[PDB]
Amino acid sequence: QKVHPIGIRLGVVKKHNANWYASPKQYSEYLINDIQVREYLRKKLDSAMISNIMIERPTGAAKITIATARPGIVIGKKGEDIERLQKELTKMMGVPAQVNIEEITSPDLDARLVADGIGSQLERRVMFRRAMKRAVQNSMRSGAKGIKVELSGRLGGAEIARTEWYREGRVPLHTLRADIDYASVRAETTYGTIGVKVWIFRGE
Amino acid sequence: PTKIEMRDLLQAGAHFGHQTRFWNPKMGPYIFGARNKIHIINLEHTVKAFNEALNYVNGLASKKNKVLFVGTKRAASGIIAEQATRAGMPYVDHRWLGGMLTNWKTLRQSINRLKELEKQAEDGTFAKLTKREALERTRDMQKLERSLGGIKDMGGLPDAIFVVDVDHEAIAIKEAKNLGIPVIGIVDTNSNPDNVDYIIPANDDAIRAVSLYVTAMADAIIAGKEYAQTQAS
Amino acid sequence: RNYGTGRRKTSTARVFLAKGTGSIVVNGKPLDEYFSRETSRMVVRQPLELLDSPTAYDLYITVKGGGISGQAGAIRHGITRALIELDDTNKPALKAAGFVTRDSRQVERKKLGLRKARKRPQFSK
Amino acid sequence: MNVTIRGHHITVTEAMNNAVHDKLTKIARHFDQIQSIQVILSLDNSGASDGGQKSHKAEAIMRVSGQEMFVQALEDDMYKAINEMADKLDRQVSKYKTRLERNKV
RNA sequence: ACAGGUGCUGCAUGGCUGUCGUCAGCUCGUGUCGUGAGAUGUUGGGUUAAGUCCCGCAACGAGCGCAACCCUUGUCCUUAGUUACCAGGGAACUCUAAGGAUACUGCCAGUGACAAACUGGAGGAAGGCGGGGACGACGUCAAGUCAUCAUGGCCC
Numbered sequence: 001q002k003v004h005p006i007g008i009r010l011g012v013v014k015k016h017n018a019n020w021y022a023s024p025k026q027y028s029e030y031l032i033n034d035i036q037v038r039e040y041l042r043k044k045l046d047s048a049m050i051s052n053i054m055i056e057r058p059t060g061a062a063k064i065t066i067a068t069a070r071p072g073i074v075i076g077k078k079g080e081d082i083e084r085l086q087k088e089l090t091k092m093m094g095v096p097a098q099v100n101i102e103e104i105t106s107p108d109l110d111a112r113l114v115a116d117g118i119g120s121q122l123e124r125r126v127m128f129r130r131a132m133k134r135a136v137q138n139s140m141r142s143g144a145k146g147i148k149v150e151l152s153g154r155l156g157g158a159e160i161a162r163t164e165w166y167r168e169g170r171v172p173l174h175t176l177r178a179d180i181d182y183a184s185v186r187a188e189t190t191y192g193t194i195g196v197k198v199w200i201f202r203g204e
Numbered sequence: 205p206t207k208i209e210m211r212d213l214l215q216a217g218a219h220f221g222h223q224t225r226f227w228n229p230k231m232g233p234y235i236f237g238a239r240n241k242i243h244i245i246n247l248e249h250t251v252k253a254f255n256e257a258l259n260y261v262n263g264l265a266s267k268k269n270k271v272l273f274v275g276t277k278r279a280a281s282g283i284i285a286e287q288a289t290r291a292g293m294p295y296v297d298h299r300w301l302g303g304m305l306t307n308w309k310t311l312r313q314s315i316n317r318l319k320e321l322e323k324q325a326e327d328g329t330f331a332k333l334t335k336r337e338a339l340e341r342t343r344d345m346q347k348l349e350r351s352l353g354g355i356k357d358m359g360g361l362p363d364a365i366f367v368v369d370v371d372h373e374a375i376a377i378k379e380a381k382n383l384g385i386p387v388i389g390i391v392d393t394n395s396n397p398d399n400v401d402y403i404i405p406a407n408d409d410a411i412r413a414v415s416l417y418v419t420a421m422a423d424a425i426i427a428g429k430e431y432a433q434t435q436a437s
Numbered sequence: 438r439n440y441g442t443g444r445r446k447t448s449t450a451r452v453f454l455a456k457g458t459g460s461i462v463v464n465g466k467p468l469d470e471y472f473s474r475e476t477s478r479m480v481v482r483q484p485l486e487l488l489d490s491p492t493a494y495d496l497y498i499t500v501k502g503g504g505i506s507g508q509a510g511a512i513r514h515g516i517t518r519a520l521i522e523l524d525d526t527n528k529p530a531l532k533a534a535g536f537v538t539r540d541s542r543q544v545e546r547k548k549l550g551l552r553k554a555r556k557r558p559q560f561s562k
Numbered sequence: 563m564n565v566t567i568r569g570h571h572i573t574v575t576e577a578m579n580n581a582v583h584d585k586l587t588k589i590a591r592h593f594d595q596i597q598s599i600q601v602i603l604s605l606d607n608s609g610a611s612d613g614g615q616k617s618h619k620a621e622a623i624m625r626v627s628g629q630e631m632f633v634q635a636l637e638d639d640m641y642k643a644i645n646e647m648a649d650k651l652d653r654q655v656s657k658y659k660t661r662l663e664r665n666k667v
Numbered sequence: 668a669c670a671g672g673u674g675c676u677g678c679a680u681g682g683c684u685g686u687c688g689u690c691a692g693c694u695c696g697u698g699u700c701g702u703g704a705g706a707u708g709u710u711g712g713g714u715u716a717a718g719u720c721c722c723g724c725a726a727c728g729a730g731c732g733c734a735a736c737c738c739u740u741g742u743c744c745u746u747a748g749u750u751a752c753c754a755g756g757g758a759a760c761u762c763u764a765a766g767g768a769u770a771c772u773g774c775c776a777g778u779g780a781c782a783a784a785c786u787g788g789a790g791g792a793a794g795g796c797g798g799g800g801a802c803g804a805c806g807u808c809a810a811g812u813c814a815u816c817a818u819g820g821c822c823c
Binding site for chain 5: 001002003008009011012013146148152153154158159160161167169170171172173174175176177178184186187188189190191192193194195204
């Protein structure tokens, strides 16, 4: 019922997380290998807190820009964990691609990290509304002009599923120049899957 | 300035109550008689209560306390504004917003918005805005000035309230009773004298009469402030 | 050499105006030879004859795009623009007929789930 | 007047056909202005969190001249669903017929 | 060990979707009223496409919706001139495709509560939401989807 907040804003106040050009024959190969890179790396860096990743590429090599809040664990001691992943990234990708790590100054303003933290707590059996309120409080104090988090499913283990949302601030979805971060992750609980959506509104 | 004279009160016509059908039976002690189906307020009583009210406002203003001038009647708005400004005292003269004092923590936001709009129009911020958008911001500022222009510098609850036409300002009286802040009020023959501490039985419908009471209160508060400034050195 | 550009639907006519006999050259061919539809024949001469000067100017018209009546409307708009370029006092009389206002009407796009711009699939009740 | 009796996710039997036709001809006896009847007999869920009680559905979309009235009934058993659907349809036929007859005066 | 399952359950679910409905609504904080469920705000006078706006008003404010920011089209300008154009090799014009200008009830005459607004007129390519699209509130229908995918349980 609701359009994707980033998808409907891609060209007005936002930017794609892929910036390569391919001929119509090359588009399929580039996009397929790109999706494979994203999936493999998101499964590999599950322990770390990694937000949006920009797999942009020139001819030949690529420059994969991963933004995270745990640079030490991502990079490793003297770059011993970034290079181990570098070799696999090149092994499955094409020409050797340079991966660079950027830092998230405010992890409570990134909708993906907040959603994944909520999901981790839910999987560790934390009370659902406790998690919702904790996330809303942290983000609304971390400078965010608005937050809205939505949980959907068998909350607590109930047979009848339900949707519970919590808003604080503005989050003006229908405005295109809103700079609304959005994320939608899932918490794998013992009674199914909980859907965790987070909207974070932070200006113009 | 602590005492009021009966002669000029009679000249102004503070003893003219309503007809002998709208009266509140709780105004019986102060009513002197009925002349041509019109109640006559006892000048002795109104002057006796007025002296106590003037003493109370002198004592209050000598302690740098704020007494809020309330009156929205068409025969009291401008005079209340003038005398409250003269005495440097907060006032409401157009409409008593419900919750002015009982919901003052929410009125704080509107007061702050008004004051920051005064700042933006004082530092010349209209050279960065548009034409009609700056005009609508200015209109919002003026609209808020009408409602809460006299109580922007209030900075808390008042230590007393001076209301004209208690019956008209029954909402302010109810809020004053709610919060316990004393209320001195001019109450007419048809009005309810309950919930009012310093009641002044007087005609509240004539502009000439209302001017007398409001000017007397302003002069008393001014004298109290002047005396309180005499102990600086 | 007063030149005007006119547009309509999809056609875009560039017309050149000179004081002359009345030779109208629509895209290299005469007006009547180029326009086989009399309705599209009137429209080209409508602005010239509106102010009573049909045989007073040589016209060099080059239409491109559009159909056969859209091109006539584009030529009329271009002639109107060239005539007002020649004289500004032409505009007060040539505006009351609506010859200078560009017609912004265009083919409304086919919308999804519809047969046409507005047409909807039927459903029997 | 048409009578269509379709079955979604269930095999409509001869007994179901009779149990819908007999009530349809009973309503069509008092109302003779019916254009069409379409009855869908469905099995809309498995009652996985309530134990049936609404497992079978019987819906009737009837069309009259100038109006279309739809009724539905959920029930554990399809025959009871059919009877409840029929009763709602009869009540709506009576309602429309009496409104139309009382519009003349 | 297991893998595999387009096997079952959409009435255990996530994600996605239809629908009322691009309808103008749906709520909350504080305050006040009521024993209470609740109410008020959100009602009323107008006005609008619109809970749009103004004015009143025990309400004062806020949020999601409305509107705007987005795309395209309609006029003009700037950079550029090939594979585009052709007025006289040309750098005019058409065109192509990036950045802008314009439009705001801005102006006039009226009606209107000294209001919001409405009616008409000028100029302009466009006039009052210029035309079209994207955008689909809280919820509803145990609506659709376990056969895109993921997924608790059951089953081979």
